[PDB]
Structure 1
Amino acid sequence: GAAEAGITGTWYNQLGSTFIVTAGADGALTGTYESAVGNAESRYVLTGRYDSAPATDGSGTALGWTVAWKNNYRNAHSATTWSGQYVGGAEARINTQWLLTSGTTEANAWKSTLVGHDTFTKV
């Protein structure tokens, strides 16, 4: 469907990170994420979900995905989730907010979670 075809592709955010994703027929997202910043090297697996029958009333398409920051090169003992929506057209965009949680002790849990926002384009 249109949402599947719109989301599937290679995206970059304002940091220069690379988000490569395939949207499955009934709501799955799979792919890889490479961060331009932080305790990260090479590509990391991601999985997520999207609304595979979005409203055709002008609304965006809701989606989210997770990366755990462990691969064959490094392990930052952390995970980021991005929550957002896809907007199509000639200059398609995925607008997100994200939560990055690091494994911490309980005493340090108050400072376990960063929040931010990333906007992705196919350029």
Structure 2
Amino acid sequence: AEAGITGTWYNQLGSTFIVTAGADGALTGTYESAVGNAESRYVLTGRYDSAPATDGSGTALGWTVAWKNNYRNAHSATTWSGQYVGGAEARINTQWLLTSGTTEANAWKSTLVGHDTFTKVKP
């Protein structure tokens, strides 16, 4: 359900994700990062399964933030890939990749991997 995804979410490090889920499967919003070379809000775009399986299956989704806004440019982009699990503790569990632009010779150290869990506060 788009509505269940729409809202304000925060992860374990204190970053803020504001998102709207559109009926066509689109995700749009802003990301505020608690860590890294970042300040203020960044534009996010993603896609989610707008017709998930009933069961107790999660809803698969993903989004990207490129770390450039009008105040700073970190020359990197993070994608989060995971699933939304709806309940009375609604969570988005993800794994992420962070790639920095590098020269050809430093490209072996361009991509960080980690995982983030998001807890919903507001719609």
Q: CA deviation at 1:57?
A: 1.4
Question: Residue 63 of structure 1: which of 49, 61, 64 is its match?
Answer: 61
- Which secondary structure state, in structure 1, belongs to the residue aligned with residue 115 of structure 2? strand
Q: 1:5 matched to which residue of 2?
A: 3
Q: CA deviation at 1:122?
A: 1.2
Identity, % of aligned pairs? 100
Mapping for residues 67-86 of structure 1, pairs under 5 Å: 67-86=65-84
Q: Show structure 1 runs of 4+ deviating over 2 A.
A: none
Q: CA deviation at 1:71?
A: 0.2
Q: Which stretches in structure 2 are left out of the alignment for 5+ residues?
A: none
Q: CA deviation at 1:89?
A: 1.0
Tell me the alpha carbon deviations over residues 52-83 of structure 1, each in whole angstroms, 9 at most, x when there is no partner: 00000110000000000000110000000000
Aligned partners of 2:95 and 2:87: how far apart in 1? 21
Aligned partners of 2:19 and 2:13: how far apart in 1? 18
Question: Residue 105 of structure 1: which of 103, 106, 120 is its match?
Answer: 103
Q: Which stretches in structure 1 are left out of the alignment for 5+ residues?
A: none
Aligned partners of 1:15 and 1:38: how far apart in 2? 11
Q: CA deviation at 1:26?
A: 1.5
Aligned partners of 1:14 and 1:58: how far apart in 2? 24
Tell me the alpha carbon deviations over residues 6-58 of structure 1, each in whole angstroms, 9 at most, x when there is no partner: 10000000000000000000200000000000000000000000000000011
- Count of residues in correspondence between the two structures: 121
- Which secondary structure state, in structure 1, belongs to the residue aligned with residue 4 of structure 2? helix
Q: TM-score, normalised by structure 1?
A: 0.97
Tell me the alpha carbon deviations over residues 82-117 of structure 1, each in whole angstroms, 9 at most, x when there is no partner: 000000111100000000000000100000000000
Aligned partners of 1:26 and 1:60: how far apart in 2? 18
- Which secondary structure state, in structure 2, belongs to the residue aligned with residue 116 of structure 1? strand
